[PDB]
mmCIF file of C-alpha atoms and ligand atoms in Angstrom:
data_model
loop_
_atom_site.group_PDB
_atom_site.id
_atom_site.type_symbol
_atom_site.label_atom_id
_atom_site.label_comp_id
_atom_site.label_asym_id
_atom_site.label_seq_id
_atom_site.Cartn_x
_atom_site.Cartn_y
_atom_site.Cartn_z
ATOM 1 C CA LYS A 287 -62.758 -9.392 16.589
ATOM 2 C CA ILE A 288 -59.960 -8.726 14.130
ATOM 3 C CA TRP A 289 -60.858 -5.112 13.911
ATOM 4 C CA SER A 290 -59.677 -4.743 17.606
ATOM 5 C CA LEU A 291 -56.457 -6.547 16.856
ATOM 6 C CA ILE A 292 -56.155 -4.141 14.004
ATOM 7 C CA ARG A 293 -56.673 -1.091 16.098
ATOM 8 C CA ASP A 294 -54.220 -2.253 18.757
ATOM 9 C CA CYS A 295 -51.642 -3.353 16.323
ATOM 10 C CA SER A 296 -51.478 0.176 14.946
ATOM 11 C CA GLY A 297 -51.004 2.287 18.055
ATOM 12 C CA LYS A 298 -47.905 0.150 18.386
ATOM 13 C CA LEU A 299 -46.720 1.887 15.284
ATOM 14 C CA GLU A 300 -47.523 5.480 15.738
ATOM 15 C CA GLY A 301 -43.772 5.169 15.943
ATOM 16 C CA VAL A 302 -41.832 4.418 12.764
ATOM 17 C CA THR A 303 -44.964 5.001 10.620
ATOM 18 C CA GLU A 304 -47.251 7.874 9.875
ATOM 19 C CA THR A 305 -49.573 5.355 8.277
ATOM 20 C CA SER A 306 -49.888 2.795 10.999
ATOM 21 C CA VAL A 307 -53.407 1.657 10.289
ATOM 22 C CA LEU A 308 -52.736 0.989 6.622
ATOM 23 C CA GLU A 309 -49.496 -0.806 7.561
ATOM 24 C CA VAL A 310 -51.513 -2.868 10.004
ATOM 25 C CA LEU A 311 -54.149 -3.559 7.372
ATOM 26 C CA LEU A 312 -51.436 -4.780 5.059
ATOM 27 C CA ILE A 313 -49.525 -6.982 7.550
ATOM 28 C CA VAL A 314 -52.880 -8.558 8.496
ATOM 29 C CA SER A 315 -53.793 -9.409 4.871
ATOM 30 C CA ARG A 316 -50.448 -10.985 4.355
ATOM 31 C CA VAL A 317 -50.559 -13.385 7.223
ATOM 32 C CA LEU A 318 -54.210 -14.230 6.722
ATOM 33 C CA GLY A 319 -53.035 -14.957 3.210
ATOM 34 C CA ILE A 320 -55.376 -12.561 1.608
ATOM 35 C CA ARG A 321 -55.983 -9.829 -0.801
ATOM 36 C CA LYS A 322 -56.428 -6.659 1.136
ATOM 37 C CA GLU A 323 -59.989 -6.120 0.023
ATOM 38 C CA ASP A 324 -61.067 -9.357 1.764
ATOM 39 C CA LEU A 325 -60.455 -7.974 5.242
ATOM 40 C CA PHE A 326 -63.959 -6.562 4.898
ATOM 41 C CA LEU A 327 -66.027 -9.750 4.634
ATOM 42 C CA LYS A 328 -67.908 -11.431 7.385
ATOM 43 C CA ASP A 329 -66.598 -14.386 9.125
ATOM 44 C CA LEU A 330 -63.169 -12.971 9.200
ATOM 45 C CA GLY A 331 -61.666 -13.836 12.453
ATOM 46 C CA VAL A 332 -58.071 -14.521 12.846
ATOM 47 C CA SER A 333 -57.118 -17.764 14.482
ATOM 48 C CA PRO A 334 -54.164 -18.117 16.746
ATOM 49 C CA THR A 335 -51.200 -19.002 14.576
ATOM 50 C CA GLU A 336 -52.519 -15.998 12.663
ATOM 51 C CA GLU A 337 -52.935 -13.594 15.641
ATOM 52 C CA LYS A 338 -49.536 -14.966 16.643
ATOM 53 C CA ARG A 339 -47.797 -14.016 13.404
ATOM 54 C CA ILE A 340 -49.414 -10.561 13.473
ATOM 55 C CA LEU A 341 -47.919 -9.112 16.729
ATOM 56 C CA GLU A 342 -44.763 -10.909 15.754
ATOM 57 C CA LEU A 343 -44.514 -9.047 12.435
ATOM 58 C CA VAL A 344 -46.078 -6.045 14.058
ATOM 59 C CA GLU A 345 -43.252 -5.578 16.398
ATOM 60 C CA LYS A 346 -40.571 -6.632 14.050
ATOM 61 C CA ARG A 347 -41.937 -3.373 12.556
ATOM 62 C CA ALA A 348 -42.292 -1.054 15.491
ATOM 63 C CA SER A 349 -38.469 -1.380 15.444
ATOM 64 C CA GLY A 350 -37.990 0.401 12.012
ATOM 65 C CA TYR A 351 -37.432 -2.838 10.000
ATOM 66 C CA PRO A 352 -38.999 -2.279 6.525
ATOM 67 C CA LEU A 353 -42.691 -2.897 5.938
ATOM 68 C CA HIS A 354 -41.997 -3.950 2.401
ATOM 69 C CA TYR A 355 -39.541 -6.550 3.487
ATOM 70 C CA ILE A 356 -42.170 -7.959 5.734
ATOM 71 C CA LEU A 357 -44.732 -7.722 2.957
ATOM 72 C CA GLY A 358 -42.369 -9.182 0.331
ATOM 73 C CA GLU A 359 -43.658 -6.686 -2.234
ATOM 74 C CA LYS A 360 -43.784 -2.997 -3.177
ATOM 75 C CA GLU A 361 -46.105 -1.357 -5.732
ATOM 76 C CA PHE A 362 -44.363 0.967 -8.173
ATOM 77 C CA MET A 363 -45.957 2.440 -11.382
ATOM 78 C CA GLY A 364 -48.909 0.246 -10.461
ATOM 79 C CA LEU A 365 -46.970 -2.964 -10.440
ATOM 80 C CA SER A 366 -46.085 -5.379 -7.784
ATOM 81 C CA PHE A 367 -42.357 -5.739 -7.362
ATOM 82 C CA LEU A 368 -40.998 -8.517 -5.197
ATOM 83 C CA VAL A 369 -38.503 -7.153 -2.651
ATOM 84 C CA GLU A 370 -36.371 -8.962 0.097
ATOM 85 C CA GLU A 371 -33.548 -7.872 2.459
ATOM 86 C CA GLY A 372 -30.563 -7.022 0.278
ATOM 87 C CA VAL A 373 -32.669 -5.268 -2.365
ATOM 88 C CA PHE A 374 -33.420 -1.546 -2.271
ATOM 89 C CA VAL A 375 -37.160 -0.854 -2.035
ATOM 90 C CA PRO A 376 -38.543 1.283 -4.765
ATOM 91 C CA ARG A 377 -39.478 4.785 -3.744
ATOM 92 C CA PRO A 378 -42.380 6.799 -5.084
ATOM 93 C CA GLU A 379 -40.296 9.685 -6.018
ATOM 94 C CA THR A 380 -38.645 7.453 -8.644
ATOM 95 C CA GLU A 381 -41.932 6.833 -10.585
ATOM 96 C CA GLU A 382 -41.382 10.362 -11.746
ATOM 97 C CA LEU A 383 -38.148 9.503 -13.482
ATOM 98 C CA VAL A 384 -40.020 6.742 -15.361
ATOM 99 C CA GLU A 385 -42.820 8.885 -16.560
ATOM 100 C CA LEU A 386 -40.266 11.365 -17.857
ATOM 101 C CA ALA A 387 -38.468 8.437 -19.415
ATOM 102 C CA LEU A 388 -41.675 7.248 -21.085
ATOM 103 C CA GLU A 389 -42.431 10.754 -22.496
ATOM 104 C CA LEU A 390 -38.894 10.619 -23.912
ATOM 105 C CA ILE A 391 -39.353 7.193 -25.609
ATOM 106 C CA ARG A 392 -42.573 8.528 -27.236
ATOM 107 C CA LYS A 393 -41.082 11.847 -28.119
ATOM 108 C CA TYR A 394 -38.077 10.332 -29.913
ATOM 109 C CA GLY A 395 -39.031 6.789 -30.864
ATOM 110 C CA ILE A 396 -36.218 5.528 -28.599
ATOM 111 C CA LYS A 397 -35.790 1.841 -28.746
ATOM 112 C CA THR A 398 -32.858 0.840 -26.596
ATOM 113 C CA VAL A 399 -32.505 1.913 -23.011
ATOM 114 C CA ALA A 400 -30.320 1.096 -20.057
ATOM 115 C CA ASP A 401 -31.032 1.124 -16.254
ATOM 116 C CA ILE A 402 -27.785 1.380 -14.123
ATOM 117 C CA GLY A 403 -28.216 -0.014 -10.597
ATOM 118 C CA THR A 404 -31.519 -1.810 -11.273
ATOM 119 C CA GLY A 405 -32.201 -2.989 -7.745
ATOM 120 C CA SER A 406 -35.560 -4.731 -7.803
ATOM 121 C CA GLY A 407 -35.788 -3.633 -11.458
ATOM 122 C CA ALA A 408 -38.509 -0.984 -10.773
ATOM 123 C CA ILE A 409 -37.184 1.438 -13.472
ATOM 124 C CA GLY A 410 -36.302 -0.863 -16.378
ATOM 125 C CA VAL A 411 -39.016 -3.348 -15.820
ATOM 126 C CA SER A 412 -41.608 -0.555 -15.880
ATOM 127 C CA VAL A 413 -40.062 1.103 -18.927
ATOM 128 C CA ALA A 414 -40.223 -2.372 -20.647
ATOM 129 C CA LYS A 415 -43.707 -3.112 -19.692
ATOM 130 C CA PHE A 416 -45.066 0.292 -20.602
ATOM 131 C CA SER A 417 -43.272 1.066 -23.871
ATOM 132 C CA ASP A 418 -41.606 -0.872 -26.645
ATOM 133 C CA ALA A 419 -38.083 -0.218 -25.530
ATOM 134 C CA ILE A 420 -35.592 -2.958 -25.029
ATOM 135 C CA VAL A 421 -33.675 -2.448 -21.663
ATOM 136 C CA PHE A 422 -30.132 -3.310 -20.482
ATOM 137 C CA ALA A 423 -29.900 -3.402 -16.736
ATOM 138 C CA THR A 424 -27.059 -3.761 -14.257
ATOM 139 C CA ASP A 425 -26.411 -4.129 -10.636
ATOM 140 C CA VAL A 426 -23.359 -4.825 -8.490
ATOM 141 C CA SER A 427 -25.571 -7.036 -6.296
ATOM 142 C CA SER A 428 -26.101 -10.451 -7.318
ATOM 143 C CA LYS A 429 -29.169 -10.368 -5.127
ATOM 144 C CA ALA A 430 -30.609 -7.417 -7.064
ATOM 145 C CA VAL A 431 -29.778 -9.167 -10.339
ATOM 146 C CA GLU A 432 -31.840 -12.158 -9.168
ATOM 147 C CA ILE A 433 -34.919 -10.351 -8.011
ATOM 148 C CA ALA A 434 -34.864 -8.088 -10.955
ATOM 149 C CA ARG A 435 -34.725 -11.084 -13.277
ATOM 150 C CA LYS A 436 -37.807 -12.476 -11.523
ATOM 151 C CA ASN A 437 -39.719 -9.278 -11.499
ATOM 152 C CA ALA A 438 -39.128 -9.212 -15.225
ATOM 153 C CA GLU A 439 -40.459 -12.675 -15.515
ATOM 154 C CA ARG A 440 -43.236 -11.814 -13.152
ATOM 155 C CA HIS A 441 -44.371 -8.957 -15.478
ATOM 156 C CA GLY A 442 -44.017 -10.596 -18.887
ATOM 157 C CA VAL A 443 -40.948 -8.664 -20.043
ATOM 158 C CA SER A 444 -38.010 -11.044 -19.811
ATOM 159 C CA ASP A 445 -37.801 -10.897 -23.548
ATOM 160 C CA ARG A 446 -37.092 -7.084 -23.445
ATOM 161 C CA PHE A 447 -35.245 -6.599 -20.096
ATOM 162 C CA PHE A 448 -31.828 -8.117 -19.633
ATOM 163 C CA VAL A 449 -29.894 -7.745 -16.362
ATOM 164 C CA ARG A 450 -26.213 -8.344 -15.974
ATOM 165 C CA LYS A 451 -24.136 -8.277 -12.838
ATOM 166 C CA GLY A 452 -21.429 -5.693 -12.634
ATOM 167 C CA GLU A 453 -20.958 -2.005 -12.431
ATOM 168 C CA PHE A 454 -22.083 0.876 -14.447
ATOM 169 C CA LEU A 455 -22.476 -0.434 -18.023
ATOM 170 C CA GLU A 456 -19.292 -2.491 -17.902
ATOM 171 C CA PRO A 457 -21.124 -5.719 -18.568
ATOM 172 C CA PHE A 458 -22.768 -4.481 -21.780
ATOM 173 C CA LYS A 459 -19.920 -2.861 -23.509
ATOM 174 C CA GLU A 460 -20.822 -4.717 -26.765
ATOM 175 C CA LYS A 461 -24.004 -2.652 -26.470
ATOM 176 C CA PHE A 462 -22.868 0.657 -25.312
ATOM 177 C CA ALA A 463 -23.115 2.262 -28.738
ATOM 178 C CA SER A 464 -26.590 1.140 -29.569
ATOM 179 C CA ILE A 465 -27.935 2.692 -26.306
ATOM 180 C CA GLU A 466 -29.951 5.773 -26.673
ATOM 181 C CA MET A 467 -31.083 6.556 -23.199
ATOM 182 C CA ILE A 468 -29.278 5.729 -19.947
ATOM 183 C CA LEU A 469 -31.423 5.704 -16.801
ATOM 184 C CA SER A 470 -30.456 5.500 -13.102
ATOM 185 C CA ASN A 471 -31.528 6.081 -9.565
ATOM 186 C CA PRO A 472 -28.100 5.629 -8.163
ATOM 187 C CA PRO A 473 -26.791 5.958 -4.583
ATOM 188 C CA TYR A 474 -26.610 9.674 -3.753
ATOM 189 C CA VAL A 475 -26.514 10.020 0.053
ATOM 190 C CA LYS A 476 -23.701 11.813 1.772
ATOM 191 C CA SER A 477 -22.049 8.719 3.294
ATOM 192 C CA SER A 478 -21.294 11.267 5.909
ATOM 193 C CA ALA A 479 -24.811 10.060 6.769
ATOM 194 C CA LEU A 480 -31.333 1.122 8.635
ATOM 195 C CA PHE A 481 -31.892 -2.040 6.807
ATOM 196 C CA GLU A 482 -31.425 -1.509 3.102
ATOM 197 C CA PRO A 483 -28.086 -2.085 1.460
ATOM 198 C CA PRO A 484 -25.192 0.377 1.786
ATOM 199 C CA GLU A 485 -24.164 -0.243 -1.794
ATOM 200 C CA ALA A 486 -27.612 1.285 -2.582
ATOM 201 C CA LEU A 487 -27.685 4.445 -0.555
ATOM 202 C CA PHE A 488 -24.151 5.593 -0.256
ATOM 203 C CA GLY A 489 -22.445 7.907 -2.725
ATOM 204 C CA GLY A 490 -19.179 8.724 -0.975
ATOM 205 C CA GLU A 491 -18.165 11.565 1.377
ATOM 206 C CA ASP A 492 -20.206 14.063 -0.583
ATOM 207 C CA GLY A 493 -22.658 11.612 -2.173
ATOM 208 C CA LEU A 494 -21.561 12.166 -5.762
ATOM 209 C CA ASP A 495 -19.119 9.423 -6.396
ATOM 210 C CA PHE A 496 -21.539 7.748 -8.744
ATOM 211 C CA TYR A 497 -21.910 10.601 -11.141
ATOM 212 C CA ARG A 498 -18.285 11.497 -11.024
ATOM 213 C CA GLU A 499 -17.326 8.024 -12.068
ATOM 214 C CA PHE A 500 -19.965 7.806 -14.666
ATOM 215 C CA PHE A 501 -19.690 11.110 -16.540
ATOM 216 C CA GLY A 502 -15.939 10.552 -16.087
ATOM 217 C CA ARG A 503 -15.794 7.194 -17.946
ATOM 218 C CA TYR A 504 -18.569 7.177 -20.481
ATOM 219 C CA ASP A 505 -18.898 9.164 -23.662
ATOM 220 C CA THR A 506 -22.491 10.243 -23.862
ATOM 221 C CA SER A 507 -22.654 11.832 -27.339
ATOM 222 C CA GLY A 508 -25.981 11.012 -29.022
ATOM 223 C CA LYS A 509 -27.514 9.674 -25.769
ATOM 224 C CA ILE A 510 -30.010 10.975 -23.349
ATOM 225 C CA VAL A 511 -28.933 10.555 -19.779
ATOM 226 C CA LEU A 512 -31.643 10.867 -17.111
ATOM 227 C CA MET A 513 -30.728 10.212 -13.500
ATOM 228 C CA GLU A 514 -32.378 10.793 -10.081
ATOM 229 C CA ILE A 515 -30.479 13.135 -7.746
ATOM 230 C CA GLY A 516 -30.203 14.475 -4.186
ATOM 231 C CA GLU A 517 -32.143 17.720 -3.561
ATOM 232 C CA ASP A 518 -29.017 19.721 -2.905
ATOM 233 C CA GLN A 519 -26.576 18.523 -5.507
ATOM 234 C CA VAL A 520 -27.425 20.764 -8.457
ATOM 235 C CA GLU A 521 -24.669 23.485 -8.227
ATOM 236 C CA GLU A 522 -21.995 20.791 -7.702
ATOM 237 C CA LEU A 523 -23.430 18.592 -10.486
ATOM 238 C CA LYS A 524 -23.290 21.553 -12.890
ATOM 239 C CA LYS A 525 -19.491 21.223 -12.546
ATOM 240 C CA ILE A 526 -19.022 17.519 -13.329
ATOM 241 C CA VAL A 527 -21.445 17.753 -16.151
ATOM 242 C CA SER A 528 -21.781 21.184 -17.705
ATOM 243 C CA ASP A 529 -24.551 20.896 -20.279
ATOM 244 C CA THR A 530 -27.213 19.338 -18.074
ATOM 245 C CA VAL A 531 -30.669 20.555 -17.289
ATOM 246 C CA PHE A 532 -32.284 19.837 -13.908
ATOM 247 C CA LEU A 533 -35.877 19.131 -13.028
ATOM 248 C CA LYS A 534 -38.034 19.308 -9.925
ATOM 249 C CA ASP A 535 -40.414 16.545 -8.909
ATOM 250 C CA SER A 536 -44.137 17.034 -8.013
ATOM 251 C CA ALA A 537 -42.912 18.419 -4.675
ATOM 252 C CA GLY A 538 -40.514 21.125 -5.920
ATOM 253 C CA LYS A 539 -37.254 19.674 -4.795
ATOM 254 C CA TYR A 540 -34.831 19.353 -7.668
ATOM 255 C CA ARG A 541 -34.752 15.581 -8.333
ATOM 256 C CA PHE A 542 -33.470 14.950 -11.796
ATOM 257 C CA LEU A 543 -30.587 15.556 -14.060
ATOM 258 C CA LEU A 544 -31.378 15.474 -17.816
ATOM 259 C CA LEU A 545 -28.530 15.560 -20.267
ATOM 260 C CA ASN A 546 -29.957 15.323 -23.757
ATOM 261 C CA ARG A 547 -27.242 14.879 -26.436
ATOM 262 C CA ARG A 548 -29.435 13.171 -28.953
ATOM 263 C CA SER A 549 -29.515 15.056 -32.244
ATOM 264 C CA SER A 550 -31.674 16.247 -34.989
HETATM 265 N N1 SAH B 295 -21.664 1.652 -9.826
HETATM 266 C C1 SAH B 295 -22.769 0.937 -9.795
HETATM 267 N N2 SAH B 295 -23.070 0.222 -10.881
HETATM 268 C C2 SAH B 295 -24.206 -0.528 -10.960
HETATM 269 N N3 SAH B 295 -25.032 -0.567 -9.919
HETATM 270 C C3 SAH B 295 -24.747 0.113 -8.801
HETATM 271 C C4 SAH B 295 -23.611 0.865 -8.701
HETATM 272 N N4 SAH B 295 -23.629 1.492 -7.499
HETATM 273 C C5 SAH B 295 -24.759 1.131 -6.857
HETATM 274 N N5 SAH B 295 -25.439 0.252 -7.642
HETATM 275 C C6 SAH B 295 -26.750 -0.357 -7.382
HETATM 276 O O1 SAH B 295 -27.643 0.750 -7.454
HETATM 277 C C7 SAH B 295 -28.890 0.467 -6.850
HETATM 278 C C8 SAH B 295 -29.290 1.721 -6.032
HETATM 279 S S1 SAH B 295 -30.944 1.837 -5.289
HETATM 280 C C9 SAH B 295 -32.162 2.133 -6.569
HETATM 281 C C10 SAH B 295 -32.652 0.761 -7.064
HETATM 282 C C11 SAH B 295 -33.696 0.913 -8.141
HETATM 283 N N6 SAH B 295 -33.203 1.574 -9.335
HETATM 284 C C12 SAH B 295 -34.826 1.781 -7.643
HETATM 285 O O2 SAH B 295 -34.850 2.862 -8.274
HETATM 286 O O3 SAH B 295 -35.493 1.316 -6.727
HETATM 287 C C13 SAH B 295 -28.599 -0.756 -5.981
HETATM 288 O O4 SAH B 295 -29.311 -1.906 -6.345
HETATM 289 C C14 SAH B 295 -27.097 -1.014 -6.057
HETATM 290 O O5 SAH B 295 -26.811 -2.382 -6.188
#
């Protein structure tokens, strides 16, 4: 059977994953070359090369290597984002930033938006696909820039999502002024601490370098700045940026900084 294979592949993963069966289900679909809902048909056996690939990938995973890198894909705001080693894998917590972002575009009629450190493009691509905004996106990784460009093509929004390599908004200076809302899910981990990129997790000794450099260099008058943040960085953020508000996600951990300097 392939349902035994499935059940043995998973015990192998009551390590790294809490959701071993589902991760097995997904690794199986991907080798068999199939949509996940096809696993249920009859005449669904898995023939060698196949069974071969599955324990292969299955153990590459018991190790802690990322599922989504194996899968080549991660769903975020209901969309399929291509991901590969070198790109940060979108996290569920971040969908919250986007829905808050969307509520903001509707509330104000915002038309131009930026997404600092785009990664796979999860934030800006979703904002583009689900609103009328135009989005300027940046990443220091040329590998993120690439994948993000394709995810934009992949979702029909290359005409409203532009990514440029470089840091912060340095590559879009010509556009700084016209930008109404600045979005980011930047590195915020105490570097005073895994297969995702360092550039993407680490925020210096205290995990704030990113905000210190940003609110330090950019004049934000007239703009709405919405950024994801570490659970424990509120009190210290209140001193780099004094007029910000701070929201909790669906869980109750503070997760977002909102600095609304739009007017009237
Ligand atoms: N100063 C900086 N300017 C622009 N991008 C930066 C940067 N510092 C880190 N990055 C980028 O920030 C991203 C952080 S990970 C988050 C990626 C994506 N926004 C998501 O939410 O899934 C990485 O892709 C990294 O390349």
